[PDB]
Structures are given as C-alpha cells and as structure tokens.
Write a structure and sequence with these properties.
Chain B: Its main location: cytoplasm. The structure is cut from a larger assembly and holds chains A (127 residues), B (181 residues), C (42 residues), D (214 residues) and E (283 residues). Chain B has a three-stranded antiparallel beta sheet. A three-stranded antiparallel beta sheet of chain B has the order 4-6-5, sandwiched between helices. Helix content of chain B is 56%, strand content 18%. The two termini of chain E are 40 Å apart. The chains are: A alpha/beta (127), B alpha+beta (181), C mainly alpha (42), D alpha+beta (214), E alpha/beta (283). Chains in contact: A-B, A-D, B-C, B-D. Chains A and D meet through strand 8 of A and strand 2 and strand 3 of D. The structure holds two RNA strands.
Chain lengths: 127, 181, 42, 214, 283
RNA sequence: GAAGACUAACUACUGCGAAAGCAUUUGCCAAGGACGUUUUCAUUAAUCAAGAACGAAAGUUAGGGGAUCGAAGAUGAUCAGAUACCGUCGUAGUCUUAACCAUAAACUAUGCCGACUAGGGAUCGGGUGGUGUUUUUUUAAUGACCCACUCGGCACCUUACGAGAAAU
RNA sequence: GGAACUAAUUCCGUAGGUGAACCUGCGGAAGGAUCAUUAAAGA
C-alpha cells in the first residue's frame, strides 16, 4: 500500500538516535536526534527531546518519497547496559502517531555470546 | 486502513492476565475503541486498529505498551495507568549490568532490594511514586521519567551493596526535595 | 514527613489524579472529631 | 545549497522467482553519470525482508531472508538468495528454563557450487504425563541427536543444488525428518533450521540467475 | 578536624623543636590553639597558618588580652598557596593529606627552616625514614632523605584524639640539608621515578619499558642537537638503538641487575652521573 | 578487518575432583567413584613422627603477549552538603611458556576407619522387577516416561525413646 | 596630597601510593534484615 523504509531507533541514555534509511540500508534519508533539539547536555536523552526529533524526522521522511517504515529499536548493548533508553519508546510513540504507517518492529541490540571484560573493574561503575 | 501490532505473552505471567482477561480487554476495546484478539495456541496478543472506530493513531501504540506493561509482570491497575498518563515509562536493567555477581552473591543482592517482607522494595516506590518488578536478574520500573531516574539511583545504590539505611536516607532526601517542588 | 514502608493502596493513575485535583484532609477530620468531643465534655 | 533527494533516481527491487510475492521495495541511487554511475552502486546491495511479508501467510512471522542484488536492467533490478536468519524476539521466547537446548551445524556444498553453513536448534520437551519438570536429556542423548541432525543436514545440502534447498526450507521438511529420526532418542520440541549463511559463491553465470526469475 | 585529647603530649613536640627565645615559629594547622599558646610563651614570634576562618577567629579570641597576644601573627588560607616568611623552626598539626605536598614545600622553601617537627600518619612517617633494604623504602624516602635527614620521634595511638582516627599516628623531625647537594631536583627525581615503579624489578627491566626508551632517546637526540653530534642511522626503531646505549651504560656502571629497593643515595648519584655523562638526561 | 581476553542467557550451590579448583565444541591421552557381580586373591589392613606429591590471588626470574581492566605515578575540579567522595591519563600487572615462592577466615569458622540408634517425601547415578503409559508400522525391538524395590551421592522436611547454655 | 561647591557495613589475603585524619586495585568471607509471584506441553 505504502512506500516502505527502515526506521531504526538507537536509544541509549544521555541521547536518543532516530534516523530512517532505504529498506536495504545503504542509502539513508534524514536523521536528527534528541541532542539536536535541546541545549543543556543533561537533557539530551529525555522523551521531550526525542519527540521533537521524531517530529523533524517525520517531516523529512515524508518530504523525500517515504510514507511508511519498519522500526528496529536498540539499546547500547555489547558489554553495556542492554536495557532500552528512556527516549526510544517515546521517540517511537511520537513517530507512530504521525501518519507514517508502521509494520513489524523487532529489537536489534547487540548481545554477545557474552564476553570482552566489562569496563569498571571489580568495584563496577555507575552509582 | 488497518494496523496490526502483535505482542508475545510470557507463560509465567500468562495465567494471571488470562484470569483477569475479562477485566483486561474491556477498557481497551470499549474505552479506547480497539481490536484485541488472543491466540491461546501461539500465546500472542493481537492489537488491531480500525480507522472508522479509532479516533487517535497513538491509542493503538498505547494499547501495545499497556499489554507489554502487564507482560512484564506489572499489575492490571498499573497497566491501566499507562493508557491514562503519557508520562509513565518502564525501565529494565540486568544486575550483571551494574555489578558482576555470582551465585549466592547475586541472590542476597536481590534481597537487599526486596528486604524483609518487601519492606525495602515498597519504600522506594512510595517515595518515588513508581512500580517496580523484581524478576530474576531483571528489574523493571514504571513511572515518570524524573521519578524513575531517582528510583534507579536508589535501586543501584542497593545493588552496589550499600546498607538499606543509607538508601532510606537518600530516599527521604530525594522524596522531600521532589514533593517539595 | 516520614516515608511509609506499607504498600500505598492508591495506584499510580490514582496518585496522579490526587495531584491533578483547611490544612489537610486527614488532619481536619481529626480536628472536627476532637471539637465535637470537647463540646460534649464541656 | 544542493538537496540530495533532488538528484538520485528511484529504483525497483524484484525478489526470486520461487517466492509468494516478486515485488519487495524501492531504493535511491544517484544518476548514472559519466565517471561514477548508478549501475555500480545497485549490484552489491542486500535486503532483509521477513518472508511473511514475502509469503503473506503469518505462520512464518519469524524467519528472515537475505536477498542480494546481482543484475540490473533499467528501473528493474533482480535478486537471488544470500542467506536466512531467525528473528531475535522469536528466539528469546523459545529459550524456556528447565529444558535442554541443542544446537548443531555443518558447512556443506550444493550443486551450483555455493558453499554454506546451516544451523539447527531444538529443545527437550516434557512427556505429556510427566511428573518431573526439568525433562533434561543425557549428553549421550545430546551427542546422538546432533550426529543425526548433522547427518540429515549434510544429506539435504548435497542433494539441493542451491535454489532447491530454498524450496526445501520454506515448507520445513528438514524440521520434520529431524523430529522423525529423533523421537526414538528423546522427545524434543521446536526444532528449526534457525540460521543459514553463505560464505563462498561460485561465479556470476548470468544465465543461471535469469532462469530463477520468471 | 580532630583535637589532641592528650594534654601531656604537646609538651613533648615543643621540647623536640628546641625553641630559642629569638625564634620565629611557623605553626601550620594550629587548630584550637592548644600548642599555639605554649609556643607564644617560649618564642619571639609565632606565625600560625590556618585554613579555616572559624578556627582563626577562635585563635585570636584565645590569646586576646593575654601578655603574649602581640607575638602572634595568623596567616589565613591554604598553606600550600601561602608565600611563607622566614621562620627558624616549624611545628605542624595540619591534615595528613596535605602532609605529602607540604614536606616538599618546606624542603624547597627559600632559606629552609633550621628544624621542623611534624605530625604525620604511621605509614607516611615510616616511609619518610625508611632506608634501603626495607620493604617500605621508596621514592618518598629517597626524595626526602637526599634533601634532609628525618628522625621518627614518638608513636601516638588513635585514642589520644576526640574523635579518634582509624590509622595510628607518629611525629617525625625534618632538618634541611645545608647547603643542599648541587644536583638538579628534576634530574634526580626522573632517574629515581623510573627504577622504583618496580623496586624488585632490576634496573635493566625498568629501562626496557617502551615509554622509558622513548624518553631517553628523545633526550639523547636533544643533547646531540645541542652539541652537534651526529647520530648514526638506526636500523629500525630508534628504541632498539637506544636499548643498546642504555644496556652499555648499565653494564659499564655495574647496575644492570641492581634494584631500587636496595640502592642507596650514592648508588643513585653514581647511576645518574653515568647516564648524564653519556648525554642522557631525565629532564 | 585486525588483536587479545572471556565463555553471558540456559545456571540448578546442583554435578565432578584429594584439595586448590572445574561451565563453547569436537579429537586424542591416560585416570576415578558408585553400582552390578554364585569372578579372583585371602588379612594383603586402620591411623600415622620422619620424608614426599599437589596448592587460589598477589608477588619473583627469563622469554613471548600485552585487547581489557588496571597497585604505582600524574591529573580534574573542589561549590552550601557529601543524603548521590568520584572522574581522567595510565606504569607494573592482568594472559602464556620454563622455573620460583609456598602461604588464605586454604572454613562445614566442626582428624581418620568402622559400628549401632528414627520417621518422611523429592532428586543425581547404577541395577532388578511390570499381560504400567506414550512413540506406529503390522505388532515388536528401541527410546522417553509411570509405579515398587535396592545399593551409593548432593541435600531438605518432621521429630525423638537422645544431646546441648541455647541457637540448634 | 591641597582647598571649594553642589548632590545624597565489617573483615581477609596481596600490591602500590606526593592534597594518605589513610586510601586504592584484584580475589575472597558474612561473623549482613527474602517482600511478592510461581502448572500454563493448561495437548
């Protein structure tokens, strides 16, 4: 029915990436993030910003020749947090209600058959 | 002009949700106007949006979030809150994320979050207006962003092996400085 | 103010509604009981 | 002062002949210019489409396919097989607690000498009357299962030219012959190919690629 | 901030300072002024250096109206950032954390104090006075020791405080060497720093580190640029040619298999000379 | 695309080892307990000063390796506080070979061998018994499962006709 | 400078240390306060 592209949302903490590409991936179409739509460092991840970046992305998305899109949501991953950032579901919620018909969305956070020593040491990191 | 979102249902949380099902699907289909099918054989909930009966495009996305919230072992009332208030989000992390713990060390760690008779776990939610789920190695949080960030720091302080008292201190500190504002 | 360990009966949707919506609702009902008792005493 | 969108030319991607729907998706390139052209860029791209979007039927929600572009002909670029994956969400649900997981794999050749490594996973199921919840096989069990799976997989790969394996995987006959030779060792549930990758393809041969397309 | 609950201890520190009636005494960290009041009666002047403005105000109040008030000067602020006047002797009771920078500020002060009596931690103080052949012996020991001789004077148990500290506390005396030996401080420290990072590991092991070879080569190339001495073509990495030059120096002086943990001040002076004479400097 | 480390989820304090310890997979090499046993030898044994084999992390010698994390060292700012005392660079080290050291709350904070005294349901391994279940093909044979029993395991439950200052 | 005018948690082993009232890395111990849910091959 529509013209399909790929949404692909990387939502870590301290920032959230939204950017749509051609269904193959090789050629992209507009990006914009949460760090872009506010200036305060501390407020780089928050849903409020992602919503704004969802808004910008939706504009250019339909500005070229895309009408619909499948999303591939994703946390940091690797030897890092493994859990979805705040402004990723909020970045998808603001992208869902924008006309761009969605379809089939899986998680793609890189998960290892574990290893490479995590950072932090025996004491560990964030507190 | 349809839309189809399909969410898998966990077997452990499958029985309570199916039992309350009769309390579950009516607020969706009736209050939000939505199609809620349920495949028992595939254990998958299917949320479809009808253009004629759906006023808001976001409601279909909201319905999927509500099903997932209950999926994560949260209460039906907590799931209902997600539809009612937008500002409510869920955060999930692995104990192995914050501090690599083996065997009993992990076990005890979990207890420091729960506490005797849930007392340690209940205090954090009340002072942070949130809902927490203590699964296996996964912990889930449900509530406002500003509320969740304070709650996550308190939970992490516990998982780092800090004594419960200290965490009570930080807890009433934060709850005071936020309920004041 | 002291945080209460006992589980809050009010749900997250319910607590937000109270914020969305005399000195205190519990304290005034303490004051209203206790003046009805004092006039009985007098 | 340029705008990338107002310069590229829209292209059409067509799936292999042995599929439910030939049409797949559209892509952006860059005008076939003298010195650097639109012809070169299109040839090396691949596309991951869930075959349920590619077969329609939903009893196929998982299982993703790699379609690689090899040849092009004016607003019409064809594709062939490049691999198969599962979906991450489906795989996570399958790994239930208190049950043995079993995987096995082999690198094996076809007729039209593509070389591939195919995968296979299965889990010990509970006997429908069984009091004990764990239902774990016995390593000796596991060893035997993998050797038979390995046996069956090598038989299918050598017999299949390349496209035939494709025609073999879609109705999942493999999945069942496994269960059949297996049920004499130990129960088992799920049992899927899970993942297949390509690592050595022969040579272009423009003739063979055209035959697959209808 | 802790206080000395032992009133019969300050007297021993004051005795070991060997006050003359003409002395200017620098007191660093006077606290509540327990030592200050006693020092004022025996010296010509007390220059008290205190970080806390509250403690400085209380100290002025304590001596106020006494006949020795006019012999107290209070310098307010961080002693590290203070330009210190002339003083004959020093007494310290400041926080242990500063103690480390503070010692080298005292040693490098222009005209060094004739004598000093300082309160440090049990481990720090033991390091200051440690000699070669000792496990504690380290950079601090030898850095402090070449400049001046340090004597460990009494042990002070934690219970003699209010509140009491966790680690045990002592009092070491430091007398600046006069005149100090004519060796660049940077040159002496650079050679000493590389060997110690692993006292047990031989000198040749300490000088085979990539970073150390790079440093010594760069400095040899600098010396040769200064004196117009040509360097033959290096077959590959420069660090390999400098490796031969470092190993020849260590073999020539007998130091290849020696360790910092058992090397004295004369051993380090001899090794430093042997590298310097060959055009290799550590600064 | 390269390098080196590691073995997540499954994971179960179960399962194995003298203990340290041992978790991708496959091949090879030798080893072991328990069980079965109308086999064999026939007192060959128990425990052990001296003496000896092994032994976690760190550390040491000589090579290699040196991704990561990171004693030392150098730094960041130090605000009202510290309820939320860390952040950065990073030497040794972390890995491996050949050799050292030779001790840990090396802990069940409980010598070894044997023998007697009391109940219960689970589970790991082995074996025996069944016109048990399920797998279909044409019934079987297999396999997985169910019931009863029996050796030997890792544990839990309840109690005493027992013990303790009491937890037990 | 002069002279007018206006205005007004504990601990162990090990290693190292110059902002070391002691701390820090690696590995151990507890002699440290378990709430809640739990048949979903429920073919």
């Amino acid at each position: 029915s529509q013209v399909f592209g790929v949404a692909r949302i990387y939502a870590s903490f301290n920032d959230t990436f939204v950017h749509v590409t051609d269904l193959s991936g090789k050629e992209t179409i507009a990006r914009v993030t949460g760090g872009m739509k506010v200036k305060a460092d501390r407020d780089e991840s928050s849903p409020y910003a992602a919503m704004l970046a969802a808004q910008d992305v939706a504009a250019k998305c339909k500005e070229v020749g895309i009408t619909a899109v499948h999303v591939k949501i994703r946390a940091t991953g690797g030897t890092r947090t493994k859990t979805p950032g705040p402004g990723g579901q909020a970045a998808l919620r603001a992208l869902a209600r924008s006309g761009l018909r969605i379809g089939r969305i899986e998680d793609v956070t890189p998960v290892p058959s574990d290893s490479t020593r995590k950072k932090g040491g025996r004491r560990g990191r964030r507190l | 002009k349809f839309e189809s979102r399909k969410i898998m249902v966990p077997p452990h949380r499958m029985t309570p949700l199916r039992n309350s099902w009769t309390k579950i699907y009516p607020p969706l289909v009736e209050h939000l106007k939505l199609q809620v099918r349920m495949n028992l054989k595939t254990k998958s909930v299917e949320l479809r949006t009808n253009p004629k009966f759906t006023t808001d495009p976001g409601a279909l996305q909201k319905g999927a979030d509500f099903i997932k919230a209950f999926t994560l072992g949260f209460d039906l009332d907590d799931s209902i809150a997600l539809l009612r208030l937008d500002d409510l989000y869920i955060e999930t992390f692995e104990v192995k994320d914050v501090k690599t713990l083996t065997g009993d060390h992990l076990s005890r760690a979990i207890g420091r979050i729960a506490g005797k008779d849930g007392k340690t776990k209940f205090a954090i939610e009340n002072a942070t207006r949130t809902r927490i789920v203590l699964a296996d190695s996964k912990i889930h949080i449900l509530g406002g962003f500003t509320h969740i960030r304070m709650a996550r720091e308190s939970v992490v302080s516990l998982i780092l092996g800090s004594p419960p008292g200290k965490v009570y201190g930080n807890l009433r500190t934060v709850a005071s400085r936020l309920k004041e504002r | 103010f002291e945080l209460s360990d006992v589980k809050s009966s009010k749900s997250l949707a319910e607590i937000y509604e109270d914020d969305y919506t005399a000195l205190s609702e519990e304290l005034q009902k303490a004051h209203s009981e206790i003046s009805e008792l004092y006039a009985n005493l007098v | 002062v340029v705008d990338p969108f107002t310069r590229k030319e829209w292209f059409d991607i067509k799936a292999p002949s042995t599929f439910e729907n030939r049409n797949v998706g559209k892509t952006l390139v860059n005008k076939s210019t003298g010195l650097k052209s639109a012809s070169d860029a299109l040839k090396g791209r691949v596309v991951e489409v869930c075959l349920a979007d590619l077969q329609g039927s939903e009893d196929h929600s998982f299982r993703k396919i790699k379609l690689r572009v090899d040849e092009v002909q004016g607003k019409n670029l064809l594709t062939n097989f490049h691999g198969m994956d599962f979906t991450t969400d489906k795989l996570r649900s399958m790994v239930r607690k208190w049950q043995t997981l079993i995987e096995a794999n082999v690198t094996v050749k076809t007729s039209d000498d593509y070389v591939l490594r195919i995968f296979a996973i299965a889990f010990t199921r509970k006997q429908a009357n069984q009091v004990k919840r764990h239902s774990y096989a016995q390593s000796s069990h596991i060893r035997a299962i993998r050797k038979v799976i390995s046996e069956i997989l090598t038989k299918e790969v050598q017999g299949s030219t390349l496209a035939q394996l494709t025609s073999k995987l879609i109705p999942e006959v493999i999945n069942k012959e496994i269960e059949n030779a297996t049920k004499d060792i130990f129960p088992l549930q799920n049992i899927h190919v899970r993942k297949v990758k390509l690592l050595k393809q022969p040579k272009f041969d423009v003739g063979a690629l055209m035959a697959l397309h209808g | 901030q802790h206080i000395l609950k032992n009133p019969l201890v300050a007297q021993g520190i004051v005795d070991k300072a060997q006050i003359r009636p003409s002395d200017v005494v620098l007191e660093v960290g006077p606290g509540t002024g327990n030592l200050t009041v006693r020092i004022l009666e025996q010296a010509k002047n007390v220059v008290a250096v205190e970080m806390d403005p509250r403690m400085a105000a209380e100290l002025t109040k304590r001596v106020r109206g006494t006949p020795v008030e006019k012999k107290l000067e209070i310098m307010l602020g961080d002693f590290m950032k203070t330009e210190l006047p002339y003083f004959d002797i020093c007494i310290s009771n400041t926080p242990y954390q500063i103690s480390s920078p503070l010692v080298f500020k005292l040693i490098n002060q222009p005209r060094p104090p004739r004598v000093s009596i300082l309160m440090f931690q049990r481990e720090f103080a033991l390091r200051l006075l440690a000699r070669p052949g000792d496990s504690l012996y380290c950079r601090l020991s030898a850095n402090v020791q070449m400049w001046a001789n340090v004597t460990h004077i009494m042990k002070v148990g934690k219970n003699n405080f209010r509140p009491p500290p966790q680690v045990e506390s002592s009092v070491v005396r430091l007398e600046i060497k006069n005149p100090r030996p004519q060796v660049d401080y940077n040159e002496w420290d650079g050679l000493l720093r590389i060997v110690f990072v692993r006292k047990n590991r031989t000198i040749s092991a300490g000088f085979k580190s990539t970073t150390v070879m790079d440093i010594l080569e760069k400095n040899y190339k600098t010396f040769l640029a200064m004196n117009n001495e040509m360097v033959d073509d290096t077959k590959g990495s420069m660090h390999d040619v400098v490796k031969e030059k470092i190993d020849t120096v260590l073999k020539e002086t007998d130091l290849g298999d020696k360790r910092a943990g058992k090397c004295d001040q004369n051993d380090f002076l001899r090794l430093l000379y042997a590298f310097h004479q060959v055009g290799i400097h550590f600064s």
